[PDB]
Swiss-Prot record:
The gene is siaP. The keyword Transport applies. PANTHER family: PTHR33376, SIALIC ACID-BINDING PERIPLASMIC PROTEIN SIAP. Part of the tripartite ATP-independent periplasmic (TRAP) transport system SiaPT involved in the uptake of sialic acid (N-acetyl-beta-neuraminate). This protein specifically binds sialic acid with high affinity. N-Acetylneuraminate (sialic acid) can then be incorporated into the lipooligosaccharides (LOS) as a terminal non-reducing sugar, protecting the bacterium from complement-mediated killing by normal human serum. This is Sialic acid-binding periplasmic protein SiaP. Keywords: Periplasm, Signal, Sugar transport, Transport. GO terms for cellular component: outer membrane-bounded periplasmic space.
């Protein structure tokens, strides 16, 4: 095609992310009259999300996914998006990004500094904790060998609840669980399904600890080359895809209990009061490290009423 473009992702071919990206690619092909074709590169073929964000910056990859929280790699205060238990729900995640001074200035920085244009935001689920033994309370987290992604906020979740974290890439997790090299991991229900972690984890605990969004990102090097009518095709398609993406996750969160129980998984509901209390020193550390900018981001986000 005139524009043979590429969309990379960590998520695999059975995932909601991939299904929504498929929708995006199909609409862009159709509505561009075939001028743009977007091919998909799932399962970390191109590297992880850190690597793929660098590829958007350089222009060697056209589209990718990231969370708002991922930008804590560049702007430490943006860890606010993934401080456990701070963001109540997706409604808060949306307003935090688009309707705070903090969020709006982040979007502008992603463009100016990082060479990426934010097309749309979707919901990517609320992370829960799977394991090879029951988590009936916070006591069961003590010394649990808990895999985490290579992200500071997930590492801190594991540390402050009393677990023993092992960072590793998403692609490596299934084998780590299967072999019991680690005891557990944490991800939204949809990812537990998509990666088939239920095959290698007997237990799931509703820790409700971090809320993931999902940003549809384009490389400025690519977006600048598209005539403006095709830019609009791409933006409109990303917006349509994000709405579908969010629905896939919302529907799955009300539907997946039946699925996991049918697969033999035991689901627990530990008291979250001590999980939340265990985070108080982390929040203090975040404020110490990120200073006024972090205190401000937290104030702005904690001001958002969670009720639609
Ligand atoms: O790659 C992205 C893009 O948002 N998100 C990945 C996500 C992400 O890299 C982390 O939440 C850090 O922001 O990590 C996982 O949840 C995981 O490795 O458990 C996989 C998920 O696909």
């Amino acid at each position: 095609a005139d524009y043979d473009l590429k969309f990379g992702m960590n998520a695999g071919t059975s995932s909601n992310e991939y299904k929504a990206a498929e929708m995006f690619a199909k609409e862009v092909k159709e509505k561009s009259q075939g001028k743009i074709e977007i091919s998909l590169y799932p399962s970390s073929q191109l590297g992880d999300d850190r690597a793929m964000l660098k590829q958007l910056k350089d222009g060697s990859l056209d589209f990718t996914f990231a969370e708002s929280a991922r930008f804590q790699l560049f702007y430490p205060e943006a860890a606010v998006f993934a401080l456990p238990y701070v963001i109540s729900n997706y409604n808060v995640a949306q307003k935090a990004l688009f309707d705070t001074e903090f969020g709006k200035d982040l979007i502008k920085k992603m463009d100016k500094d990082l060479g990426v244009t934010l097309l749309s935001q979707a919901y990517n689920g609320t992370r829960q904790t799977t394991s090879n033994r029951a988590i009936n309370s916070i006591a069961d987290m003590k010394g649990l060998k808990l895999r985490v992604p290579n992200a500071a906020t997930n590492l801190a979740y594991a540390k402050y609840v009393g677990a023993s974290p092992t960072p590793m890439a998403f692609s490596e997790v299934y084998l780590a669980l299967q072999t019991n090299a680690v005891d557990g991991q944490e991800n939204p229900l949809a990812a537990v399904q998509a990666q088939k972690f239920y095959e290698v984890q007997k237990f799931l605990a509703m820790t409700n600890h971090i809320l993931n969004d999902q940003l549809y990102l384009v490389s400025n090097e690519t977006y600048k080359e598209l005539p403006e009518d095709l830019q609009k095709v791409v933006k409109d398609a990303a917006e349509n895809a994000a709405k579908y993406h969010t629905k896939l996750f919302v529907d799955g969160e009300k539907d997946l209990v039946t699925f996991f129980e049918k697969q033999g998984v035991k689901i627990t509901h530990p008291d979250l009061v001590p999980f939340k209390e265990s985070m108080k020193p982390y929040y203090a550390e975040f404020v110490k490290q990120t200073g006024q900018k972090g205190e401000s981001a937290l104030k702005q986000i904690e001001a958002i009423n969670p009720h639609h």
